[PDB]
Amino acid sequence: RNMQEKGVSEKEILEELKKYRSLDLKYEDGNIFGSMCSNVLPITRKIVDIFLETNLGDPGLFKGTKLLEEKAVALLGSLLNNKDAYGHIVSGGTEANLMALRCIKNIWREKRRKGLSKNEHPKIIVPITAHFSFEKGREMMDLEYIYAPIKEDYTIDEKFVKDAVEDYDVDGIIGIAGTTELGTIDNIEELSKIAKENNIYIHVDAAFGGLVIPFLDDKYKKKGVNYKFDFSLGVDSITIDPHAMGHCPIPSGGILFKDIGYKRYLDVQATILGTRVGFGGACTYAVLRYLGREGQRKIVNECMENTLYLYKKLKENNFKPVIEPILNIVAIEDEDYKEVCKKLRDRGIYVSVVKALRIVVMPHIKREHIDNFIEILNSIKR
């Protein structure tokens, strides 16, 4: 508990907080196997402190922090082969996807006002592998989704999309570059061709994959898998999150549009949030500058090294991975996955739960953690 009249000392409240923090898991401890967040680059702690008292909801008061957001967006745009990208460092991939959906809906609204659409709601083709943020957008914005099926490799069925675009009036297409559950990559090149030929907005959700795919060594690329996903394909927008594989503190999400022409369709401030952090843009810019491509490549392929190590140890121990990994994500088929996940928790191993256990090999997962995991899983299986 209740609000009290008298205050307490700093030592008292800090000691209480540290007691609660001790109940948390920590990324570096070998417990967390199912998270797409990880330890932040240590330099970001100083940056957060420097920029803590900024607010990109009032950029007129923080001109330098606003310039750093623009520079962060420019570095992401350059990474994605688009020097003219218009975008924002937002709160996460959810706000980024919601902003893309707002844009899609407002393009549709303009058509409706001219009589150029028989759809009473925007009609959007969305693969069934789409992240839950897309359901939040549908539920809030009254969108109609045409759920696209996936093929045997768990990527979107491009022929279905092409057929649906022929039959139906379609207002948007979603493709995923690094799905949440398995890390697979939709055929963005074909989707973008369908979209361009039919004048349909295409959004690429690269929340996770956007900071992984551009850095993959050829050893980890698979024949037949297409890795192109960015603005070189002419897509309309891309979600890409520094607080996932960019080692930046939450909140650091990213939404990039092809050019500034898209800004007018975000009119109602283009972000959903009002008051909002300035340190996300500063950290995004600084981490990408500090690492350069070489530093991020090292981290990404270190994760891929450990991902393929985990995949190999799984098969050696007669476990069945859902797929050979595409990104730093592996899933283990298990009919008793719910109970096995709970047994793993009791032994200090936290995976996520497709009837499978899901492991995200973030930079905090080392070979010793994978060895420990296999030992505990073997033991659980009798």
Ligand X SMILES: CC1=C(O)/C(=C\N=C/Cc2ccc(O)cc2)C(COP(=O)(O)O)=CN1
Using CB under 8 A, which of 128, 149, 264, 292 touches its own copies? Answer: 292
Name the residue nearer to its own copies (CB basis): 264 or 381.
264
Stretch that binds ligand X, among 87-95, 117-125, 287-295, 370-378 (CB under 6 A): 87-95
Q: How far apart are CA 352 and CA 364, in angstroms?
A: 16
Q: Which residue has the tokens 């000392």?
A: 9
Structure tokens at 8: 């307490």
For residues 252 and 210, give the distance between their C-alpha atoms in angstroms, rounded to a whole number. Answer: 13
Shortest distance in whole angstroms from residue 363 CB to its own copies: 12
Binding region for its own copies (CB under 8 A) out of 184-192, 276-284, 308-316, 318-326: 276-284
Q: Pick the binder of ligand X from 27, 31, 35, 309 (CB under 6 A).
A: 35
Burial annotation 337-371 (CB, 10 A radius, 16+ → b, else e)? beebbebbeeeebebbbeebbbbbbbbbbeeebbe
- Nearest to its own copies of 54, 117 (CB atom): 54
d(CA 26, CA 149): 37
Minimum CB separation from ligand X for residue 37, in Å? Answer: 4
**Which range in 147-155, 160-168, 171-179, 247-255 contacts its own copies by CB under 8 A?**
247-255
What's the Rg (C-alpha) of the chain?
22
Structure tokens at 31: 């417990």
CA distance 362 to 137: 28
CA 347 to chain centre: 29
* Shortest CB 6 distance to ligand X, Å: 29
Nearer to its own copies, 275 or 318 (CB): 275
- Selected from 31, 50, 55, 66, the binder of ligand X by CB under 6 A is 55
Q: How far is CA 267 from CA 102, 106, 133, 367, in A?
A: 9, 9, 21, 48
Figure out which of the listed residues 233, 255, 282, 300 binds its own copies, where binding follows CB under 8 A. Answer: 282
Question: Residues binding ligand X: what is the number (CB under 6 A)?
Answer: 22
Q: Rule CB under 8 A: which of 349-368 touch its own copies?
A: 350
Judged by CB under 6 A, the residue of 88, 102, 131, 369 near ligand X is 131
Q: Which among its own copies, ligand X, none contacts residue 140 (Cβ within 5 to 8 A by kind)?
A: its own copies
CA atoms of 347 and 365, how far apart (whole Å): 17
> Can you tell me which of 2, 113, 223, 316 binds its own copies, judged by CB under 8 A?
2
241, 255, 363, 373: residue in contact with ligand X (rule CB under 6 A): 241
Number of Cβ within a 10 Å radius of residue 252? 27
CA separation for the pair 3, 71 (Å, rounded): 43
How far apart are the C-alpha atoms of 250 and 245, rounded to whole Å?
Answer: 12
Give whichever of 77 and 178 is closer to ligand X, judged by the CB atom.
178
51-70 positions binding its own copies, by CB under 8 A:
51-55, 58, 60-65, 67-68
Applying CB under 6 A, which part among 151-159, 166-174, 185-193, 203-211 lies near ligand X? Answer: 203-211
Looking only at residues 167 through 186 of this chain, which bind ligand X when binding is defined by CB under 6 A? 176, 180
3-class DSSP state of 363:
coil
HSE-up of residue 50 (Cα within 13 Å, Cβ side): 14
Tokens linked to 327? 């990104």
Kindly state whether residue 226 participates in binding ligand X, applying the rule CB under 6 A: no
Residue 13 touches which of its own copies, ligand X, none (Cβ within 5-8 Å per kind): its own copies
| 346 binds its own copies, rule: CB under 8 A | no
3-state secondary structure of 317: coil
Establish how many alpha carbons lie within 13 A of residue 26's alpha carbon, considering only the half-sphere containing its beta carbon: 7
Indicate which single residue of 35, 119, 198, 372 sits in contact with its own copies (rule: CB under 8 A): 35
- Interacting residue ranges for ligand X, rule: CB under 6 A: 35-37, 55, 57-58, 61, 92-94, 97, 131, 133, 176, 180, 205, 207-208, 241, 253, 274-275
